[PDB]
Ligand binder design. Structure first.
Ligand SMILES: O=c1ccn([C@@H]2O[C@H](COP(=O)(O)OP(=O)(O)OP(=O)(O)O)[C@@H](O)[C@H]2O)c(=O)[nH]1
Length: 384
């Protein structure tokens, strides 16, 4: 009798889902030990092995089950050489030995994937966590650190919001990279852009990177100073109150992307709503800078390894083409990675747009229009 309580229960259920997903107290020790295990494998396969984690276990937007992204570097590694045939060949020799050593040390389901960009995938033989190892994923490491810094501002606020977006995204196949929809990183970035638009995160409008990209120190510096509205100071000890703030943000998120004009606009944390064509210009500038430095490093390698010379213009051209095809401004979605201007949304196929748009429609309808009918198990119902 005017006694509907759907919204209250939905907020309660969603904050409980968040709380249930959080890694236990000792999880940082678990992940640290995982890093050491992988380093042990690394030290067998390559000289001066160095292992960096990235992805959600670094950002902190994770569950204890979240997979692990790992970046392997070595003596005289250069981020600028990947693409050069001879060095790609060498990186394959490193990953081939890495895969064998990982099997020997007791990693399960080890799969070495031979390619110009080689990767080794496996299930950790201690935790069961799925691991992805690649050489010198410098962008990955850097953007994960920025995301970590963002979360640090108010971990449970940003944490719950992102968690629920992802949980929804996965259930509804909006986050399904193998089905040609979004990956988690791309939707995370999207969700954060809404927070920026709401004044709940600063805009990173001053990238100072050598190639015009946003750096970790750029981000940390802005966030150090950033203030949330004063009300947020009373939300740290009560999930009913905090859940009202996260609920409002989820509403805004759903509505934002059910309505966002992607024909004109991109998603960016550096410049929210920046036009596709301006992103194009930024990309073109970025690629000139990248190309100059790339060629310079290719020459430096050849000077030290003459039998790999002379510089192969065809291969160098192909490498630059690969940089270009990573940053298209005309794909169904353009979601900008702030550390390298890569379009991380580029793989989403035109035929998938309907499903993505429809799921955002459904989410908006449920969170806003049919608020009185809210049921957590319905909103986050697994697709099919
Ligand atoms: O398009 C991409 C995808 C991924 N990445 C880089 O790889 C990392 C992992 O990419 P994921 O999409 O797995 O991000 P995640 O760890 O936040 O997702 P969950 O596993 O929790 O579902 C990200 O943190 C980013 O550094 C990109 O740079 N671009």
């Amino acid at each position: 009798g005017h006694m509907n309580v759907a919204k209250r229960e939905f907020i309660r259920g969603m904050m409980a889902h968040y709380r249930a997903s959080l890694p236990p107290p000792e999880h940082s020790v678990v992940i640290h030990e995982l890093q050491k295990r992988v380093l042990d494998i690394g030290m067998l396969a390559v000289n001066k092995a160095h292992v960096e984690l990235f992805g959600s276990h670094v950002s902190g937007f994770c569950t204890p089950h979240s997979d692990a992204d790992i970046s392997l570097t070595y003596r005289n590694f250069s981020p600028w050489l990947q693409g050069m045939e001879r060095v790609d060949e060498q990186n394959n020799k490193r990953m081939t030995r890495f895969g064998k050593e990982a099997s020997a040390m007791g990693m399960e389901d080890v799969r070495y994937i031979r390619a110009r960009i080689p990767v080794v995938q496996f299930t950790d033989g201690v935790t069961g966590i799925h691991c992805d190892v690649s050489i010198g994923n410098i962008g990955g490491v850097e953007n994960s650190k920025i995301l970590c810094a963002i979360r640090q501002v108010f971990p449970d606020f940003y944490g719950a919001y992102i968690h629920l977006v992802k949980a929804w995204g996965k259930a509804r196949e909006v986050i399904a990279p193998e089905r040609s929809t979004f990956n988690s990183f791309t939707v995370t970035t999207m969700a954060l852009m809404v927070l920026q638009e709401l004044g709940l995160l600063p805009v990173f409008s001053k990238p100072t990177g050598e190639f015009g990209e946003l750096t970790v120190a750029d981000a940390e510096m802005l966030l150090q100073e950033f203030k949330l509205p004063p009300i947020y100071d009373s939300l740290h000890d009560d999930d009913e109150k905090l859940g009202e703030a996260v609920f409002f943000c989820l509403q805004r998120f759903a509505e934002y992307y059910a309505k966002y004009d992607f024909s004109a606009g991109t998603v960016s944390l550096i410049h929210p709503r920046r036009h596709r064509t301006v992103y194009e210009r930024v990309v073109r500038r970025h690629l000139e800078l990248l190309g100059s430095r790339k060629r310079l490093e290719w020459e430096k390698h050849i000077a030290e390894h003459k039998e790999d010379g002379p510089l192969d213009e065809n291969d160098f051209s192909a490498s630059m083409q690969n940089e270009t095809t990573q940053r298209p401004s005309n794909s169904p979605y353009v979601v900008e990675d702030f550390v390298n201007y890569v379009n991380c949304g580029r793989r989403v196929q035109a035929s998938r747009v309907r499903h993505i748009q429809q799921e955002f429609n459904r989410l908006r309808e449920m969170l806003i229009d049919k608020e009185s009918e809210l049921k957590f198990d319905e909103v986050f119902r697994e697709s099919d």
